Design a protein around this ligand. Structure first.
Ligand SMILES: NC(=[NH2+])c1cc2cccnc2s1
Lengths: 248, 9
């Protein structure tokens, strides 16, 4: 995240950190995600696309730091990894960039509620906040686009949703942004999501609840004027999510 | 206790 403040997981208790194991001894951070129900986390397909080998990913909940432990954290394995059939990438956008990870602990359980682990709410069928609404994004992504390391402390910032008319303007992204995406930026292009924040949540309040309105998906540069961050429009995937998720 | 979506404590 560029700008923003450093936080702790109590402030984003539904944030999931996804890492990959390497034959050699190291685990590296891959992307962020959000907990929907006790056994399912949602992220972006582009994070797995290149290495869809579920056995090699580890998911942690209750984590405020990237490579040091946080007390109360939970580690899980990915029992199922569902990528979107119809996922596409072009010279900028990712289409249908949503994925589901069903988690299983080494004891056979899903997430347990704590002060650092909570689920986030899903919107209702095609229901979104109005442009102007301030939403918060969270993650361990870069703090500057030129960095080549990620922060060790979790970050969060606030951006506002902008309309499709504004985002599809030729000097922004033109028709690379579709109806299944949402764009959010800082009025003064000072804070934004960036590489390493992929898969994480764009949370806004809708009808009284903190709702997962978008998933960090792509953007040109980071915190670049007239280059908003584009997020997957969760409200438009509800049928898809439903057809794959079940029980507690 | 149990999950309450969207609640920070
Ligand atoms: N919000 C942005 N400007 C983003 C830039 C990137 C770059 C890579 C992956 N995700 C994102 S979001």
């Amino acid at each position: 995240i560029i700008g923003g403040e450093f936080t702790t997981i109590e402030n984003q208790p539904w944030f999931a950190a996804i890492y990959r194991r390497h034959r050699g001894g190291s685990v590296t951070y891959v992307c962020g995600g959000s907990l929907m129900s006790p056994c399912w986390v949602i992220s972006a397909t582009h994070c797995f696309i290149d290495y869809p080998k579920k056995e090699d990913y580890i998911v942690y909940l209750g984590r405020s730091r990237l490579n040091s432990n946080t007390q109360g954290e939970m580690k899980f394995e990915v029992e199922n990894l569902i990528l979107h059939k119809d996922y596409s990438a072009d010279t900028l956008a990712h289409h249908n960039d949503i994925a589901l990870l069903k988690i299983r602990s080494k004891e056979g359980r899903c997430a347990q509620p704590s002060r650092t682990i909570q689920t986030i709410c899903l919107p209702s069928m095609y229901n979104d906040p109005q442009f102007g609404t301030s939403c918060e994004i969270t993650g361990f992504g870069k703090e500057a686009s030129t960095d080549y390391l990620y922060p060790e402390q979790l970050k969060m910032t606030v951006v506002k949703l902008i309309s499709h008319r504004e985002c599809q303007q030729p000097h922004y992204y033109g028709s690379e942004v579709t109806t299944k995406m949402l764009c959010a930026a800082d009025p003064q292009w000072k804070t934004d999501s960036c590489q390493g924040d992929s898969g994480g949540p764009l949370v806004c309040s809708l009808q009284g609840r903190m709702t997962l309105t978008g998933i960090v998906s792509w953007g040109r540069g980071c915190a670049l004027k007239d280059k908003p961050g584009v997020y997957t429009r969760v409200s438009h995937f509800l049928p898809w999510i439903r057809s794959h998720t079940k029980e507690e | 206790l149990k999950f309450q979506c969207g609640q920070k404590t």
